[PDB]
Amino acid sequence: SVSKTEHAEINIFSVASGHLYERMLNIMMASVMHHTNHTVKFWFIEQFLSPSFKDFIPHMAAEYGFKYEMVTYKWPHWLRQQKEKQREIWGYKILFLDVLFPLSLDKVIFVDADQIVRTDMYDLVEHPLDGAPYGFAPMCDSRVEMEGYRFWKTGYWANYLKGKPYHISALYVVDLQRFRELAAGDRLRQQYHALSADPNSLANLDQDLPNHMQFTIPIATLPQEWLWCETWCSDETLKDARTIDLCNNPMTKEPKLDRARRQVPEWTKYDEEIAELARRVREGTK
Ligand SMILES: O=c1ccn([C@@H]2O[C@H](COP(=O)(O)OP(=O)(O)O[C@H]3O[C@H](CO)[C@@H](O)[C@H](O)[C@H]3O)[C@@H](O)[C@H]2O)c(=O)[nH]1
Ligand SMILES: *[C@@H]1O[C@H](CO)[C@@H](O[C@@H]2O[C@H](CO)[C@@H](O)[C@H](O)[C@H]2NC(C)=O)[C@H](O)[C@H]1NC(C)=O
Ligand SMILES: [Ca+2]
């Protein structure tokens, strides 16, 4: 209850780098705000954001009625670094959950910058984790034509998981109090440091690490409805989706903005609403 007052009832963090992902990140935030009356605070990994995004965020905050905080955490020199920017961004999603946020924040949800929310995110805040420090949705099996690309259903992963789900990292709820109690952050950092000695390991860093650790750092498998991606999930389950991820389709290679406009009817309305807000701020400041 002290976390709800000092911060907000719903706390979401995301990571974005590049104009395309920042444009989608504003849309993700507008989609959250249109679907809840609970208080919201957005948390941003500052060093990857553009100066324009950081200058526009107080205008988004005042227009949509949310609070926000910029977090700048320095990668520890002992911890194996990532030379690829994409892999460093993935490290920021999963390696520092216990230290990016203040001790007074009890719970935080990661929501991908390219996501569209169609639900009250307070329902995820209230989802029962039963002592798991975090919850992720599983990868869908419902789009049968994509079975050849489900790498987690054959080879190394099928033998390692033994039927346990392979989870997607586009969305996850973190009970920070339980995550801290279980020292999950220190354990993920130490395991990542040891596993990353092999440069071929953790190809999908943010996703492979929690899935590899799920027999010792439990994952509360979220209802499949919490994350729908066309690449893996059936058309028929879209009407039940609480959130949508615009995940890459290895078969079609369709561009990101084309996937957004084709799959999500309300995407253009959020995009035009934020562009109208940008034009209004441009005249008021210039
Ligand atoms: O120039 C770029 C490219 C990517 N990203 C971020 O990198 C991640 C992955 O990019 P994305 O376009 O979302 O790829 P997807 O196919 O959507 O990725 C899926 O699979 C990844 C793991 O393989 C997870 O990190 C994603 O959350 C999940 O949506 C996301 O957090 C993006 O915000 C950037 O910020 N800038
Ligand atoms: C947030 O509050 C608004 C009211 O300010 C809610 O809007 C109503 O939603 C119902 C949905 O059954 C509509 O039938 C009404 O016409 C809406 N009324 C108004 C005045 O907008 C909205 O549903 C609330 N959202 C959530 C998720 O609680
Ligand atoms: Ca994504």
Short mmCIF file of C-alpha atoms and ligand atoms in Angstrom, two decimals:
data_model
loop_
_atom_site.label_atom_id
_atom_site.label_comp_id
_atom_site.label_asym_id
_atom_site.label_seq_id
_atom_site.Cartn_x
_atom_site.Cartn_y
_atom_site.Cartn_z
CA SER A 1 0.00 0.00 0.00
CA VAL A 2 2.95 2.37 0.58
CA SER A 3 4.18 1.43 -2.97
CA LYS A 4 0.74 2.39 -4.41
CA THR A 5 0.90 5.84 -2.76
CA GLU A 6 4.58 6.81 -3.28
CA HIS A 7 4.68 5.42 -6.82
CA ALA A 8 1.37 4.26 -8.34
CA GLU A 9 -1.02 1.27 -8.32
CA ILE A 10 0.41 0.14 -11.70
CA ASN A 11 4.18 0.37 -12.31
CA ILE A 12 5.47 -0.45 -15.78
CA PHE A 13 9.00 -0.33 -17.19
CA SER A 14 10.19 -0.70 -20.75
CA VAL A 15 13.30 -0.38 -22.90
CA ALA A 16 13.51 1.36 -26.28
CA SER A 17 16.31 2.60 -28.55
CA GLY A 18 15.74 4.28 -31.89
CA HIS A 19 13.00 6.55 -33.21
CA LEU A 20 10.82 3.63 -34.37
CA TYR A 21 10.83 1.98 -30.91
CA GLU A 22 10.30 5.32 -29.11
CA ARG A 23 7.32 6.07 -31.35
CA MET A 24 5.89 2.61 -30.44
CA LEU A 25 6.78 3.18 -26.74
CA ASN A 26 4.56 6.32 -26.59
CA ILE A 27 1.76 4.28 -28.24
CA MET A 28 2.22 1.47 -25.68
CA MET A 29 1.85 4.05 -22.87
CA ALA A 30 -1.27 5.61 -24.42
CA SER A 31 -2.81 2.09 -24.81
CA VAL A 32 -2.19 1.39 -21.07
CA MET A 33 -3.79 4.76 -20.03
CA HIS A 34 -6.86 4.28 -22.23
CA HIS A 35 -7.56 0.94 -20.48
CA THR A 36 -7.22 1.82 -16.80
CA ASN A 37 -8.53 4.24 -14.17
CA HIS A 38 -5.87 3.07 -11.63
CA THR A 39 -2.81 5.31 -11.08
CA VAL A 40 0.15 4.55 -13.35
CA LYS A 41 3.89 5.20 -13.16
CA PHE A 42 6.21 4.44 -16.11
CA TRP A 43 9.92 3.73 -15.49
CA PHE A 44 12.49 4.15 -18.27
CA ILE A 45 16.06 2.83 -18.82
CA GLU A 46 17.34 6.38 -19.53
CA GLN A 47 20.68 5.84 -21.33
CA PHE A 48 19.03 4.25 -24.40
CA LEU A 49 16.46 7.01 -24.90
CA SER A 50 16.83 9.97 -27.25
CA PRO A 51 16.89 13.59 -25.96
CA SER A 52 13.56 14.21 -27.79
CA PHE A 53 11.82 11.37 -25.92
CA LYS A 54 13.14 12.62 -22.55
CA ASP A 55 11.94 16.15 -23.38
CA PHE A 56 8.50 14.98 -24.58
CA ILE A 57 7.75 12.59 -21.67
CA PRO A 58 6.54 15.41 -19.20
CA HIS A 59 4.00 16.45 -21.91
CA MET A 60 2.82 12.82 -22.33
CA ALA A 61 2.62 12.56 -18.50
CA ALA A 62 0.50 15.73 -18.10
CA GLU A 63 -1.79 14.85 -21.06
CA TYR A 64 -2.40 11.20 -20.04
CA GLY A 65 -2.16 11.68 -16.26
CA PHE A 66 0.73 9.35 -15.39
CA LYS A 67 3.87 9.69 -13.28
CA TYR A 68 7.33 8.65 -14.50
CA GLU A 69 10.92 8.12 -13.46
CA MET A 70 14.17 7.83 -15.44
CA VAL A 71 16.54 5.12 -14.12
CA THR A 72 20.32 5.20 -14.97
CA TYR A 73 22.11 2.12 -13.60
CA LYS A 74 25.76 1.46 -14.47
CA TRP A 75 26.67 -2.08 -15.65
CA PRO A 76 28.99 -3.52 -12.93
CA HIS A 77 32.62 -3.88 -14.23
CA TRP A 78 32.90 -7.43 -12.79
CA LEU A 79 29.87 -8.59 -14.85
CA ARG A 80 30.58 -9.81 -18.42
CA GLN A 81 29.69 -6.95 -20.75
CA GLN A 82 27.83 -7.17 -24.11
CA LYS A 83 29.46 -5.44 -27.10
CA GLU A 84 26.26 -5.71 -29.23
CA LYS A 85 23.76 -2.88 -28.33
CA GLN A 86 20.76 -5.25 -28.69
CA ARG A 87 22.31 -7.69 -26.19
CA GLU A 88 23.17 -4.88 -23.76
CA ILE A 89 19.48 -3.75 -23.96
CA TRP A 90 18.43 -7.37 -23.22
CA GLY A 91 20.79 -7.43 -20.21
CA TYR A 92 19.06 -4.30 -18.83
CA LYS A 93 15.67 -6.05 -19.05
CA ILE A 94 16.63 -9.12 -16.98
CA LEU A 95 19.89 -8.63 -14.99
CA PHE A 96 19.11 -5.67 -12.74
CA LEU A 97 15.46 -6.08 -11.58
CA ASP A 98 16.41 -5.77 -7.89
CA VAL A 99 18.64 -2.65 -8.29
CA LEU A 100 16.94 -0.48 -10.97
CA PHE A 101 13.98 0.24 -8.72
CA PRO A 102 13.78 1.62 -5.17
CA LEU A 103 13.11 -0.73 -2.22
CA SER A 104 9.75 1.06 -1.71
CA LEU A 105 8.48 -0.34 -5.08
CA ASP A 106 6.81 -3.70 -4.43
CA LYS A 107 5.99 -4.74 -8.00
CA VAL A 108 6.85 -3.79 -11.58
CA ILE A 109 5.71 -5.06 -14.96
CA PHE A 110 7.96 -5.09 -18.06
CA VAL A 111 5.87 -4.27 -21.17
CA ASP A 112 7.65 -4.25 -24.52
CA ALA A 113 7.94 -0.93 -26.39
CA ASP A 114 6.21 -2.46 -29.43
CA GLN A 115 3.20 -3.71 -27.40
CA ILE A 116 -0.43 -2.67 -27.56
CA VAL A 117 -2.35 -3.09 -24.29
CA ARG A 118 -6.06 -3.88 -24.39
CA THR A 119 -6.70 -4.52 -20.68
CA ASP A 120 -6.53 -2.92 -17.27
CA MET A 121 -2.89 -3.63 -16.26
CA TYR A 122 -3.97 -3.61 -12.59
CA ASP A 123 -5.31 -7.16 -13.32
CA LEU A 124 -1.66 -8.25 -13.80
CA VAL A 125 -0.62 -6.43 -10.59
CA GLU A 126 -3.31 -8.54 -8.80
CA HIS A 127 -2.48 -11.82 -10.56
CA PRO A 128 -1.51 -14.45 -7.97
CA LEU A 129 2.12 -15.59 -8.26
CA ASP A 130 2.03 -18.00 -5.25
CA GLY A 131 5.58 -17.19 -4.18
CA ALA A 132 7.17 -17.09 -7.70
CA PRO A 133 9.28 -13.89 -8.00
CA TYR A 134 8.09 -13.31 -11.59
CA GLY A 135 5.56 -14.43 -14.17
CA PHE A 136 5.88 -14.67 -17.95
CA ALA A 137 3.44 -15.89 -20.63
CA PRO A 138 4.39 -19.03 -22.57
CA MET A 139 5.15 -19.10 -26.29
CA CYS A 140 1.93 -20.08 -28.16
CA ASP A 141 1.63 -23.46 -29.82
CA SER A 142 -1.74 -22.57 -31.56
CA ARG A 143 -0.28 -21.47 -34.94
CA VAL A 144 0.59 -25.01 -36.16
CA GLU A 145 2.10 -23.82 -39.49
CA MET A 146 4.98 -22.23 -37.52
CA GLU A 147 6.08 -25.49 -35.74
CA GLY A 148 9.36 -25.60 -37.70
CA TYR A 149 10.45 -22.33 -36.03
CA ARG A 150 9.60 -23.45 -32.44
CA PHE A 151 13.26 -24.20 -31.57
CA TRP A 152 12.27 -24.83 -27.93
CA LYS A 153 10.24 -27.96 -28.97
CA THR A 154 13.31 -29.91 -30.34
CA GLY A 155 17.05 -30.40 -29.55
CA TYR A 156 18.73 -28.81 -26.50
CA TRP A 157 15.62 -26.98 -25.18
CA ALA A 158 13.16 -29.90 -25.51
CA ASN A 159 15.55 -32.12 -23.56
CA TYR A 160 16.27 -29.42 -20.95
CA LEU A 161 12.63 -28.26 -20.38
CA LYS A 162 11.06 -31.74 -20.24
CA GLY A 163 7.63 -30.31 -20.99
CA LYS A 164 8.03 -27.07 -18.91
CA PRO A 165 6.98 -24.01 -20.97
CA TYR A 166 9.43 -21.92 -22.90
CA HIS A 167 8.31 -18.35 -22.05
CA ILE A 168 8.35 -15.21 -24.17
CA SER A 169 10.04 -12.16 -22.53
CA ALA A 170 7.88 -9.45 -24.14
CA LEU A 171 5.84 -9.09 -20.93
CA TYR A 172 6.54 -10.06 -17.33
CA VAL A 173 5.32 -9.14 -13.89
CA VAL A 174 7.96 -9.00 -11.16
CA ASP A 175 6.96 -9.17 -7.48
CA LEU A 176 10.04 -7.14 -6.42
CA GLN A 177 9.61 -8.02 -2.71
CA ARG A 178 9.66 -11.76 -3.45
CA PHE A 179 12.36 -11.31 -6.16
CA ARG A 180 14.53 -9.54 -3.51
CA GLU A 181 13.70 -12.20 -0.82
CA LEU A 182 14.81 -14.96 -3.18
CA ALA A 183 18.04 -13.03 -4.17
CA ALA A 184 16.89 -13.72 -7.76
CA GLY A 185 18.89 -10.74 -9.11
CA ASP A 186 22.24 -11.91 -7.70
CA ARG A 187 21.53 -15.47 -8.86
CA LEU A 188 20.57 -14.39 -12.42
CA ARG A 189 23.73 -12.15 -12.65
CA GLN A 190 26.06 -14.94 -11.40
CA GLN A 191 24.51 -17.59 -13.70
CA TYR A 192 24.58 -15.19 -16.67
CA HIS A 193 28.27 -14.41 -15.94
CA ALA A 194 29.17 -18.12 -15.96
CA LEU A 195 26.94 -19.07 -18.98
CA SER A 196 28.06 -16.10 -21.11
CA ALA A 197 31.72 -17.34 -21.03
CA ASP A 198 30.58 -19.36 -24.10
CA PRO A 199 29.76 -16.69 -26.76
CA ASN A 200 27.17 -19.03 -28.39
CA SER A 201 25.12 -19.41 -25.14
CA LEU A 202 22.04 -17.24 -24.36
CA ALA A 203 21.32 -16.34 -28.04
CA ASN A 204 18.05 -14.70 -26.89
CA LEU A 205 19.63 -13.29 -23.67
CA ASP A 206 16.56 -11.79 -21.91
CA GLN A 207 14.40 -14.81 -22.79
CA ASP A 208 16.83 -17.76 -22.51
CA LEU A 209 18.14 -16.78 -19.05
CA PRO A 210 14.79 -16.96 -17.08
CA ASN A 211 13.73 -20.07 -19.07
CA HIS A 212 17.09 -21.75 -18.19
CA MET A 213 16.69 -20.79 -14.49
CA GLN A 214 13.00 -21.75 -14.06
CA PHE A 215 13.72 -24.99 -12.14
CA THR A 216 15.49 -22.93 -9.35
CA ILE A 217 13.98 -19.37 -9.78
CA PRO A 218 10.33 -20.21 -10.37
CA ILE A 219 8.31 -18.67 -13.15
CA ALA A 220 4.57 -18.34 -12.56
CA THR A 221 3.38 -19.22 -16.13
CA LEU A 222 0.85 -16.52 -16.95
CA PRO A 223 -2.42 -17.24 -18.76
CA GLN A 224 -1.70 -17.40 -22.52
CA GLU A 225 -4.17 -14.46 -22.99
CA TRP A 226 -1.61 -12.09 -21.39
CA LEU A 227 0.61 -12.10 -24.52
CA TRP A 228 -0.52 -12.67 -28.10
CA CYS A 229 1.91 -12.51 -31.10
CA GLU A 230 0.70 -13.40 -34.60
CA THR A 231 3.89 -15.35 -35.37
CA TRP A 232 3.05 -18.01 -32.78
CA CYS A 233 -0.61 -17.54 -31.88
CA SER A 234 -3.82 -18.29 -33.81
CA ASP A 235 -6.10 -15.57 -35.33
CA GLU A 236 -8.98 -16.89 -33.21
CA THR A 237 -7.21 -16.17 -29.90
CA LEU A 238 -6.66 -12.46 -30.79
CA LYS A 239 -10.15 -11.51 -29.43
CA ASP A 240 -9.07 -12.90 -26.01
CA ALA A 241 -5.64 -11.15 -25.96
CA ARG A 242 -5.08 -8.75 -23.10
CA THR A 243 -1.83 -7.46 -24.77
CA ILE A 244 -0.30 -7.81 -28.22
CA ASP A 245 3.41 -8.10 -29.04
CA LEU A 246 4.57 -7.31 -32.65
CA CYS A 247 7.13 -10.11 -32.60
CA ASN A 248 9.22 -10.83 -35.71
CA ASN A 249 7.89 -13.46 -38.11
CA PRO A 250 10.87 -15.47 -39.41
CA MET A 251 8.76 -16.82 -42.30
CA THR A 252 7.39 -13.54 -43.74
CA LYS A 253 9.93 -10.95 -42.53
CA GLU A 254 7.11 -8.33 -42.75
CA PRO A 255 8.27 -4.85 -41.56
CA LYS A 256 7.44 -3.66 -38.01
CA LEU A 257 5.11 -0.73 -38.91
CA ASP A 258 3.31 -2.93 -41.52
CA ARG A 259 2.64 -5.63 -38.82
CA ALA A 260 1.35 -2.86 -36.49
CA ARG A 261 -1.09 -1.32 -39.02
CA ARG A 262 -2.30 -4.65 -40.36
CA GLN A 263 -2.78 -6.47 -37.04
CA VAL A 264 -3.97 -3.78 -34.67
CA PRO A 265 -6.99 -1.64 -35.66
CA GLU A 266 -6.48 0.99 -32.94
CA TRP A 267 -2.72 1.45 -33.56
CA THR A 268 -3.28 4.34 -36.06
CA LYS A 269 -5.64 6.12 -33.59
CA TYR A 270 -2.96 6.10 -30.83
CA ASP A 271 -0.25 7.11 -33.34
CA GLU A 272 -2.36 10.07 -34.60
CA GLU A 273 -3.35 11.12 -31.04
CA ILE A 274 0.33 11.27 -29.95
CA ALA A 275 1.27 13.09 -33.21
CA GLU A 276 -1.49 15.67 -32.47
CA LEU A 277 -0.04 16.13 -28.94
CA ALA A 278 3.46 16.55 -30.47
CA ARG A 279 2.22 19.30 -32.87
CA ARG A 280 0.52 21.11 -29.96
CA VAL A 281 3.67 21.03 -27.78
CA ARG A 282 5.87 22.10 -30.77
CA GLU A 283 3.98 25.44 -31.08
CA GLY A 284 3.78 26.01 -27.31
CA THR A 285 7.55 25.64 -26.88
CA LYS A 286 8.94 27.03 -30.19
O1 LIG B 1 16.61 -1.07 -32.78
C1 LIG B 1 16.04 -1.69 -31.87
C2 LIG B 1 15.68 -3.07 -31.90
C3 LIG B 1 15.10 -3.64 -30.83
N1 LIG B 1 14.84 -2.93 -29.68
C4 LIG B 1 14.34 -3.60 -28.47
O2 LIG B 1 14.83 -4.92 -28.47
C5 LIG B 1 13.80 -5.86 -28.09
C6 LIG B 1 13.57 -6.86 -29.19
O3 LIG B 1 13.12 -6.19 -30.38
P1 LIG B 1 11.75 -6.52 -31.13
O4 LIG B 1 11.48 -5.72 -32.35
O5 LIG B 1 10.66 -6.26 -30.14
O6 LIG B 1 11.83 -8.06 -31.52
P2 LIG B 1 10.61 -9.06 -31.26
O7 LIG B 1 10.57 -10.13 -32.27
O8 LIG B 1 9.40 -8.29 -31.00
O9 LIG B 1 11.16 -9.73 -29.90
C7 LIG B 1 10.63 -10.79 -29.11
O10 LIG B 1 11.67 -11.66 -28.69
C8 LIG B 1 12.74 -11.02 -27.97
C9 LIG B 1 13.70 -12.12 -27.56
O11 LIG B 1 14.17 -12.86 -28.68
C10 LIG B 1 12.21 -10.24 -26.77
O12 LIG B 1 13.25 -9.39 -26.30
C11 LIG B 1 11.02 -9.38 -27.14
O13 LIG B 1 10.45 -8.76 -26.00
C12 LIG B 1 9.96 -10.18 -27.88
O14 LIG B 1 8.91 -9.32 -28.28
C13 LIG B 1 12.59 -5.02 -27.68
O15 LIG B 1 12.56 -4.86 -26.26
C14 LIG B 1 12.81 -3.70 -28.42
O16 LIG B 1 12.26 -2.58 -27.73
C15 LIG B 1 15.12 -1.58 -29.59
O17 LIG B 1 14.84 -0.91 -28.61
N2 LIG B 1 15.72 -1.03 -30.70
C1 LIG B 2 -12.68 4.28 -16.52
O1 LIG B 2 -13.67 5.28 -16.22
C2 LIG B 2 -14.57 5.59 -17.30
C3 LIG B 2 -15.50 6.67 -16.82
O2 LIG B 2 -14.81 7.89 -16.55
C4 LIG B 2 -15.30 4.31 -17.74
O3 LIG B 2 -16.14 4.61 -18.86
C5 LIG B 2 -17.39 3.92 -18.99
O4 LIG B 2 -17.19 2.56 -19.38
C6 LIG B 2 -18.39 1.80 -19.59
C7 LIG B 2 -17.97 0.38 -19.91
O5 LIG B 2 -19.01 -0.55 -19.62
C8 LIG B 2 -19.18 2.47 -20.71
O6 LIG B 2 -20.36 1.72 -21.00
C9 LIG B 2 -19.54 3.89 -20.29
O7 LIG B 2 -20.27 4.54 -21.32
C10 LIG B 2 -18.29 4.70 -19.95
N1 LIG B 2 -18.66 5.96 -19.33
C11 LIG B 2 -17.96 7.10 -19.45
C12 LIG B 2 -18.50 8.29 -18.73
O8 LIG B 2 -16.92 7.15 -20.11
C13 LIG B 2 -14.29 3.22 -18.10
O9 LIG B 2 -14.96 2.01 -18.42
C14 LIG B 2 -13.33 2.96 -16.94
N2 LIG B 2 -12.33 1.98 -17.32
C15 LIG B 2 -11.95 0.97 -16.54
C16 LIG B 2 -11.09 -0.08 -17.19
O10 LIG B 2 -12.29 0.89 -15.36
CA CA B 3 8.45 -7.12 -29.14
#
